[PDB]
Symmetry: C3
Subunit: 309 residues, 3 copies
């Protein structure tokens, strides 16, 4: 089969609300491990990463906690390279999407040929100089794209970073709130994306066929799914830091993941931006967490038509 390599990443300094740290904990408490075990893959829990805080982490321009966000990805990258070394799918239950920098970097150190599918309401492709909020959870892709090196200033904390993925190797699914600058980068660099407009016109079925043919056409290769829980509509994942109406349906989230599983090329997965302290009610938290687990489970074989040994 395909072994699972779990990695906790309770980090929240890539953004303002500290609750996303709760992510790994709640995800675990929801029985994620035994459910993956109920399925058919070996679960190797590498535990939760201990991110020692950086006492004097002054901002870079408008960018906050640059050193914390940077060392957090650095640790994670080395962590992801090890699970991928022990021949496994890296499964990061993170806090804020700024961790994708480390997740994808450590992943690419083992399989530099990987292609990325980014399910998000946002592009998270802002740079230190285009950012207006200064939150690093909305800039991970800029530090990763090869075509943007030269546009990324040397920020404290990211000297280790080497642009690992090119414009032609990533696909966005679910966009609906892209910054004017981010949109400029999408269109200028020619990044493949399926915003809600496209999902509406093609239907999720044609969307998945097209993103997979676009990435797996010429050559088969490792697939890194970075999944931001806010890619789905707030009625399904309300306990997230930046929710936007008109998102992917419960069902569309499962299709995406069931189709990615079937390629048999999943190599790394990120389950990001879940923040239970942001659910209106205790059920809003339970709804967001269960949808996140259901999502993760489809990535590893859980199919709605059924399964059997």
């Amino acid at each position: 089969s395909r072994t699972i390599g779990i990695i906790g990443a309770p980090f929240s300094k890539g953004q303002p609300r500290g609750g996303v740290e709760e992510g790994p904990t709640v995800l675990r408490k929801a029985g994620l491990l035994e459910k993956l075990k109920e399925q058919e893959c070996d679960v190797k829990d590498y535990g939760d990463l201990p991110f020692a805080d950086i006492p004097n982490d002054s901002p870079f321009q408008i960018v906050k906690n640059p050193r914390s966000v940077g060392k957090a990805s650095e640790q994670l990258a080395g962590k992801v390279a090890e699970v991928k070394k022990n021949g496994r799918i890296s499964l990061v239950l993170g806090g804020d999407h700024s961790l994708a920098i480390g997740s994808i970097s450590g992943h690419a150190r083992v399989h530099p040929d990987l292609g990325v599918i980014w399910v998000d309401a946002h592009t998270d492709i802002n740079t230190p100089l285009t950012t207006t909020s200064g939150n690093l959870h909305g800039q991970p892709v800029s530090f990763l794209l090869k075509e943007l090196k030269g546009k990324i200033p040397d920020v404290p904390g990211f000297s280790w970073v080497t642009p690992c993925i090119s414009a032609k190797d990533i696909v966005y699914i679910g966009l609906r709130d892209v910054d004017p600058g981010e949109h400029y980068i999408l269109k200028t660099l020619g990044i493949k994306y399926f915003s809600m407009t496209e999902v509406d016109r093609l239907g999720i079925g044609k969307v998945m066929e097209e993103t997979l043919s676009y990435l797996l056409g010429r050559k088969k290769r490792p697939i890194h799914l970075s999944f931001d829980v806010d890619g789905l509509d707030p009625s399904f994942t309300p306990a997230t830091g930046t929710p936007v109406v008109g998102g992917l349906t419960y069902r569309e989230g499962l299709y995406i993941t069931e189709e990615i599983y079937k390629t048999g090329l999943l190599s790394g997965l990120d389950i990001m931006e879940v923040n239970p302290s942001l659910g209106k009610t205790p059920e809003e938290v339970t709804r967001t967490v269960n949808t996140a687990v259901a999502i993760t489970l489809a990535c590893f074989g859980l199919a709605r038509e059924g399964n059997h040994k």
Copy 2:
């Protein structure tokens, strides 16, 4: 036109919660008859079947109320054969889906060439030996399929049963919670099914075109729609005994039924698993019942584009 042959079937011993008996009553009280009359078909109410209880109905292995569930279908089968004899569409407003055994049997005694469309979140294809719950409302198809005879043990109450439908003659629409054994039967026997995954990939439009071409391709023939209210999402039919998230939308339920009506081959209909005592609030009950009536009405001509004489 096409005459309607209504049949009440207030039976609940095919499962654990006794409220599904309420089905016929609430469905009637919702004005189902006068609304069908407002449309263009003759309504002949054969009343509600009186299912005398079996005093000493001991279990078969783990299967409960086998004799009650069996005689309930037996009566219903003979009842369905009569309405189909008086040249009409049999319309069973049942309790639990175990009644499908009788509905489809009595139907096939008149038109053994019928093809079946099973709208459900479940396959209900468990046998007495594969069942874990032992509830007969999740085993009707096994007693019906010809390819499973030889696998079905002789259960008290079903000596009258003769496998009437073959694997190649039934289509599932809406699956999302199939047991590991049920999935084995689907795949082994090669039963046509459109789980939520397929509905997501093809869209309900291609799904209906494909299930109808699959059943009505070679030859036109009587169509039996067995509709489990839980085939639709709990946000539309919450007052049911086994609800599952990610189901058919209000709109998708109507399309299915509007397309089935248009074939002009509807011959039998089952409106199952509605249980008002299971609605959280009085409106949860009203929502589930009205959606059930709206569904039944589309089966008989009610179209969203409009109608006229």
Copy 3:
């Protein structure tokens, strides 16, 4: 670019509930102007039309307030012809859809070649003689269609009306509650329509491609989008006078409008039937209004993939 010509039309006598008058006000207070200004079009606010009441406006048969509804459209028509004269897109934030009579008339006096896309749960094609409610907000299309002249009796208030649009030049999107007589007109006249049934079968993507090819096939030409807020499901626009379940999703409303914008042929827009006094709660009002603004904004360039100068 394409200049915007805003027109307030706080009129409610085309129907029974007086709250729709609130429309222009709430729509404005929601920041509609500055948001359109944030985009890329010149906003010229022609203010809100003052509809002096007609003291002795007795009914025509069963038709109520004929003289008020008629003079309201008459003023509006002359108003719409002026904005269209100052080279702009007429944007009417009305009350009840009876105003479409004036909106489309004054529009056609400037561009008689316009084609119409009518997003509604209803056809609003009843005549004075087929109407049963006698509310003029459900009869605007009959006074407009050229093929129905001869069927429209001379009603007090509409002597100025000259059938401006032919059957072949209008497309309906979202129908789900058409009167038996209205359906007769649709089918008899051969009006192009995509009811919810079609939206379900084709998907909104094929629907928009087909309605645009149907109208913009032979020749490009001015497009008048008359948008009834009730065309969308009540879960998105609950504060409307005649809501019907099974409507267009939040996302489908945006696709329609994003695709219409892209043709670059939008010439007139009506944002009708919003009635805040009909929202159950203050958020039901806010939900209906924001969805209406989001809709209007997509008509003028707001795209979910993003925008930039």
